[model samples]
Target: KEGYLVDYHTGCKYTCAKLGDNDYCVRECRLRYYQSAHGYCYAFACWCTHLYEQAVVWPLPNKRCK
Candidate 1:
């Protein structure tokens, strides 16, 4: 279970409103890797976690989101 707790995020913001609920993080993380991973919200940022030491396909940046 503790192979490598990898981390990634949306860099934090004033509102994590768009994250909606746990669904966003879960979907976002799985979309980038496998179901073995998970995600969470901290300081209004979409923080994703997991995937040992493998190259993960991060979500492509959406211009509108930036």
Candidate 2:
């Protein structure tokens, strides 16, 4: 009960001459943590592996909040 599905994506680094796609996914991906790293840019896991470990950021239940 500590996780839920949200939007996240990752892809290539800034390659323009030899790769198939561009850096858009990387930008969107980083937006989470940024959306927030790993040894990213590893050939278009672009940053996807980081997303794999992503989860909900609910506040601490042990804390008192009113």
**Colliding pairs, model 1:** none
Candidate 1 Cα lDDT to native: 0.47
lDDT of 1 by residue, 28-55 (tens): 5666667776666655555556555663
How many clashing pairs per prediction, in order?
0, 7
Model 1, runs deviating above 4 Å? 1-21, 55-66
What would the TM-scores of all predictions be?
Answer: 0.46, 0.27
lDDT of 1 at 60: 28
Q: Where in model 2 is the C-alpha error above 4 Å?
A: 1-20, 34-47, 55-66
Error of 1 at 51 (Å): 2.8
**Residue 49, model 2: Cα distance from true site in angstroms:** 2.8
lDDT tens digits by residue: candidate 2, 2-66: 22212323321232222235255445445545354221344443333244444333332432222
Candidate that would win on lDDT: 1
How far out, in Å, is residue 42 in model 2?
14
